[PDB]
Design a protein around this ligand. Sequence first.
Ligand SMILES: O=C(C1CC1)N1CCN(C(=O)[C@H]2CCCO2)CC1
Ligand SMILES: [Cl-]
Ligand SMILES: [Cl-]
Ligand SMILES: [Cl-]
Ligand SMILES: [Cl-]
Ligand SMILES: [Mn+2]
Length: 340
Amino acid sequence: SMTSHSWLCDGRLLCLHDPSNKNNWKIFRECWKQGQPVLVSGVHKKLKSELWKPEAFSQEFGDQDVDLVNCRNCAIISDVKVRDFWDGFEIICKRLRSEDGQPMVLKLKDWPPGEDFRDMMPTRFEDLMENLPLPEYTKRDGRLNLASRLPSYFVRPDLGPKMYNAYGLITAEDRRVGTTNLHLDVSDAVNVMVYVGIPIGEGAHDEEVLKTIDEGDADEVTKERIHDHKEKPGALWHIYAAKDAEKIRELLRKVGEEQGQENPPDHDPIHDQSWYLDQTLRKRLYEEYGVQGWAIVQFLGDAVFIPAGAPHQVHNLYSCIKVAEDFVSPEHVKHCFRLT
Ligand SMILES: O=C(C1CC1)N1CCN(C(=O)[C@H]2CCCO2)CC1
Ligand SMILES: [Cl-]
Ligand SMILES: [Cl-]
Ligand SMILES: [Cl-]
Ligand SMILES: [Cl-]
Ligand SMILES: [Mn+2]
């Protein structure tokens, strides 16, 4: 039977099932006020699927100049054409190679650049903004989005949305690497998975994806979404409550010191965006500091709601296109205030 919602993370994560249900706010606001993330499934069914394909981005925009990041070692690949990224998205024999001769796991940096999404892609902008869930929170002029209503005493988010494009991590060694490292945002965000590319040429890499989800601490109901419904998993997230951010900084200062980094006692390892919490670090956070997080698998069409101030990291299982919009909910406006 169709149902309004369900629970993941053993009851700790709300999953809303109908992205356009006008009564979603009633279930949402109780979880959101407690500083929890929220998942909304089914957004892909509301979109024009032909606007979100890697081959269309390559054909329409392929001649623009961009920088890429090598996810395995953080090396920057400077001033290449954006088609050099898109044409290797799903076909592995077309990817740029490292010196070792392996195909690289790449992230497309800052594209479209700054606030240019709306100017470059007006039809994509319309399709996304008209179909975001919880529209009183997430639309630029929603009644519960304070972004446009705040004085300079508050840090205001840039004009969005922002696109996040990267290949899937592949090997056993890749399990310890992030697509996006641990960081926090002073605004709320909604992050939508609009396309998942399961490759060909090394298509059989499906069993290391299961070990990554399992070792990632994913709950038994999330594991059922693969085996039972054959949905496409895009990315493994870890999110932590805003209230736990200082204890995470204490762990990362102690590990930095153990690894012979030489850091002043006050430096901020979350702001640095230099760490990915692997299975060893996540267990140490729990055992030594008493901190539990949320392990979330984002499938095609899932919208992840990330609370302001919540530390979070992202690990792509397959090649992903994500589109995110920042907003300022009244529940979390304290996180962007410039005093006390
Ligand atoms: O006590 C709180 C509230 C959450 C409980 N905060 C202190 C830290 N904080 C900041 O430093 C601002 C300075 C400009 C942007 O972030 C904001 C949040
Ligand atoms: Cl909060
Ligand atoms: Cl467009
Ligand atoms: Cl709403
Ligand atoms: Cl990063
Ligand atoms: Mn973020």
